[PDB]
Amino acid sequence: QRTVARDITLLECVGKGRYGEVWRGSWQGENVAVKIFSSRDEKSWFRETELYNTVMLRHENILGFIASDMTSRHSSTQLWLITHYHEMGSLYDYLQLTTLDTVSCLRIVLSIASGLAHLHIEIFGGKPAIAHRDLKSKNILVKKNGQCCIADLGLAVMHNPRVGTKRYMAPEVLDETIQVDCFDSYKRVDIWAFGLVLWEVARRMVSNGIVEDYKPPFYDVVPNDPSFEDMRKVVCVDQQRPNIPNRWFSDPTLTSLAKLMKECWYQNPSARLTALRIKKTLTKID
Amino acid sequence: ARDITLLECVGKGRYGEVWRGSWQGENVAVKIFSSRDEKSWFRETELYNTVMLRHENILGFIASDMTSRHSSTQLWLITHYHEMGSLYDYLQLTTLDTVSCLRIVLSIASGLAHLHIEIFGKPAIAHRDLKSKNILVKKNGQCCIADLGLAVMHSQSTNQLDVGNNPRVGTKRYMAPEVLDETIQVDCFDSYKRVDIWAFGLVLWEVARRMVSNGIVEDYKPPFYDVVPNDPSFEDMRKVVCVDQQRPNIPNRWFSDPTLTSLAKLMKECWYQNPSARLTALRIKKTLTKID
Numbered sequence: 273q274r275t276v277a278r279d280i281t282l283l284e285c286v287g288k289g290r291y292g293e294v295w296r297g298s299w300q301g302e303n304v305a306v307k308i309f310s311s312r313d314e315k316s317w318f319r320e321t322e323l324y325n326t327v328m329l330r331h332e333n334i335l336g337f338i339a340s341d342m343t344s345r346h347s348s349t350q351l352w353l354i355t356h357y358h359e360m361g362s363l364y365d366y367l368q369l370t371t372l373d374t375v376s377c378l379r380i381v382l383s384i385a386s387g388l389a390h391l392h393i394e395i396f397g398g399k400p401a402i403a404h405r406d407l408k409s410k411n412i413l414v415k416k417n418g419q420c421c422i423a424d425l426g427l428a429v430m431h432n433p434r435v436g437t438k439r440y441m442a443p444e445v446l447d448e449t450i451q452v453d454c455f456d457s458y459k460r461v462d463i464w465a466f467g468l469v470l471w472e473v474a475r476r477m478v479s480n481g482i483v484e485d486y487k488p489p490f491y492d493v494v495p496n497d498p499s500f501e502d503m504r505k506v507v508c509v510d511q512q513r514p515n516i517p518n519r520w521f522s523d524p525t526l527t528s529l530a531k532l533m534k535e536c537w538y539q540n541p542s543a544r545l546t547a548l549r550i551k552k553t554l555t556k557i558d
Numbered sequence: 559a560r561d562i563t564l565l566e567c568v569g570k571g572r573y574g575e576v577w578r579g580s581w582q583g584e585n586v587a588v589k590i591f592s593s594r595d596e597k598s599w600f601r602e603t604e605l606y607n608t609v610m611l612r613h614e615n616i617l618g619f620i621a622s623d624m625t626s627r628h629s630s631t632q633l634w635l636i637t638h639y640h641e642m643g644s645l646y647d648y649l650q651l652t653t654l655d656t657v658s659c660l661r662i663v664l665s666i667a668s669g670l671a672h673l674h675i676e677i678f679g680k681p682a683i684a685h686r687d688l689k690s691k692n693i694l695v696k697k698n699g700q701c702c703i704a705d706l707g708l709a710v711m712h713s714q715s716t717n718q719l720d721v722g723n724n725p726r727v728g729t730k731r732y733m734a735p736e737v738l739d740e741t742i743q744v745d746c747f748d749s750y751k752r753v754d755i756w757a758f759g760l761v762l763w764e765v766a767r768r769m770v771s772n773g774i775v776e777d778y779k780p781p782f783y784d785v786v787p788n789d790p791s792f793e794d795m796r797k798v799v800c801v802d803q804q805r806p807n808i809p810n811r812w813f814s815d816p817t818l819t820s821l822a823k824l825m826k827e828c829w830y831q832n833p834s835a836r837l838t839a840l841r842i843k844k845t846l847t848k849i850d
């Protein structure tokens with residue numbers, strides 16, 4: 273009976289961090305992405321694996337699962353997550369060099385909204401509702417067809433000493449008022465972070481020969497690797513929001529996207545738009 | 559060298575399938591879980607993450623995998639392969655002398671005490687499905703405990719109890735009275751250790767029946783063979799254990815043999831209806847270390 277070919281050739285390291293490493297790998301002639309977890313971040317492997325063991329997500333705007341592997345070593349456990357490989361890399365990577373036109377900007381943001389609404393929605397029969405809890409431009413990959421997909425469900429909750437990336441934390445997370453037993457609270461945290469990503473992308477959309485340089489959200493008001501307190505003072509105490517440049521108000525697409533961002537950034541989480549309402553609004557732009 | 563050849567199916571049931579396979583020139587066991595038992599696969603994976611679980615009397619772990627394309631998911635556990643099979647298989651076809659009987663039961667006590675005792679690491683672990691089909695026989699005549707899919711973990715360091723999320727229940731024939739009457743104290747780690755001790759007592763009985771004394775041995779029988787239907791229901795077991803207060807009978811021939819007299823005493827102290835009266839795994843290991 274059958275050969276189970278499990279060998280993956282690790283070809284190129286495409287990410288190194290506290291989480292561990294991501295490699296471009298080869299399996300049976302095909303590219304795969306291999307995330308090798310640090311000891312420090314084993315709980316992210318467990319949570320993503322538990323989720324995929326609960327529901328095998330399959331969606332064009334969700335990074336495609338291939339496998340979770342645990343391998344015993346002499347004195348340690350090796351944990352790999354294997355997924356589809358997107359050679360263009362992360363949206364963060366892509367926006368550094370590339371500028372966008374109206375069609376590519378909308379395609380990027382509507383594909384993200386699509387992936388996020390798919391996470392958020394409970395389907396009966398189906399999938400539980402899922403909140404991501406660490407949405408940001410480094411956790412979004414660019415596909416060759418110009419749509420994106422959402423990655424990293426290591427913090428996801430279904431209806432870990434890891435917490436979300438501080439720069440993208442909603443005000444209720446920073447002021448510890450989040451209603452932690454209400455699933456909808458976690459959806460509203462993702463909408464906040466989505467609005468920051470929408471801002472990051474919109475800056476790189478050209479209008480009337482103008483574009484902004486790539487900057488991360490709050491680049492002008494917090495340090496690199498901002499503290500929790502740094503973020504709380506900006507977002508909660510002073511209630512700052514990312515700048516909308518004047519030049520956007522000459523462009524109908526960027527004018528509509530500015531309005532959309534605003535409705536992701538209400539202090540009151542329950543006032544924020546839903547991912548489904550963001551999709552509809554994006555489908556009516558242009 | 560990661561690839562695996564599946565050579566022979568050694569078992570198919572509700573648990574899924576187990577294959578004898580070849581890996582880096584060695585026999586390995588490859589369990590493919592039924593899609594209905596996915597919570598067991600995940601729990602066994604959480605347990606085998608613990609480097610200090612490793613023990614001569616615990617089934618040795620190689621790898622765990624979840625694989626998927628489209629809507630199809632496979633769940634794999636890859637372990638050491640024990641070609642002598644389970645203790646259940648072994649006892650069908652062989653009788654034991656004193657030395658072999660004690661080697662087998664002390665090895666199982668050794669495994670179980672290793673599970674139950676926290677290492678300050680490895681959490682304290684209660685198995686919850688101990689039975690002769692979940693014990694493998696090794697060529698050195700010791701055994702190893704398998705199938706951690708129902709395990710409960712506790713750390714007294716942090717006062718944390720992890721009962722997991724598995725709808726699966728233990729094998730009905732081996733369920734303790736408090737499991738069968740559903741009065742078990744579910745937020746008490748000691749409750750689950752006591753359930754393991756009950757099932758250990760039943761395994762001791764199965765083994766001891768196969769040890770020869772004075773030219774006599776009993777035929778292999780599973781616990782409660784005489785008092786329940788074939789393929790007993792939960793309620794069948796509850797009737798005999800809880801309502802009828804039945805315990806496996808001690809053959810009178812055991813009482814002329816010192817070893818079987820000692821083992822009968824040990825079984826009885828695993829079988830109290832009061833869970834708190836039952837011996838600990840460490841006490842059983844110590845008692846079996848002193849018996850000959």
Ligand SMILES: COc1cc(-c2cncc(-c3ccc(C4CCN(C)CC4)cc3)c2C)cc(OC)c1OC
Nearest residue numbers: 275276277278280299339340341354623625632634
């Ligand atoms: C264990 O580990 C890894 C395995 C694999 C892999 C390699 N070839 C074939 C397979 C395969 C898929 C599915 C079936 C089905 C066939 C139909 N039947 C009714 C149910 C079972 C059999 C075999 C797999 C899953 C890849 C891996 O990584 C790329 C693995 O490591 C993570």
Ligand SMILES: COc1cc(-c2cncc(-c3ccc(C4CCN(C)CC4)cc3)c2C)cc(OC)c1OC
Nearest residue numbers: 286294305306307353355357358361362411423424
């Ligand atoms: C966020 O999360 C995960 C992401 C990925 C992932 C999937 N496709 C492609 C990539 C990638 C490829 C290539 C570049 C660069 C490298 C330099 N030069 C060649 C330009 C391009 C960057 C990024 C990644 C990092 C996999 C993951 O797990 C397996 C992730 O974790 C869930």
Ligand SMILES: COc1cc(-c2cncc(-c3ccc(C4CCN(C)CC4)cc3)c2C)cc(OC)c1OC
Nearest residue numbers: 299300302304337338339624625626627628630631
């Ligand atoms: C993990 O990932 C990959 C796996 C595979 C792969 C390898 N062998 C066998 C299979 C397979 C065959 C048949 C069934 C089904 C068919 C219908 N019914 C009868 C139930 C059983 C399932 C699975 C697969 C899917 C290939 C892949 O890529 C080409 C994979 O992706 C990288």
Ligand SMILES: COc1cc(-c2cncc(-c3ccc(C4CCN(C)CC4)cc3)c2C)cc(OC)c1OC
Nearest residue numbers: 568587588589635637639640643644647692704705
């Ligand atoms: C219980 O649990 C697990 C067990 C195993 C495992 C490991 N070595 C050997 C075996 C075995 C081999 C052969 C027979 C023979 C005996 C009699 N003959 C007439 C038919 C068949 C029985 C048993 C098994 C079943 C692997 C597992 O995971 C990979 C298990 O799950 C944790």
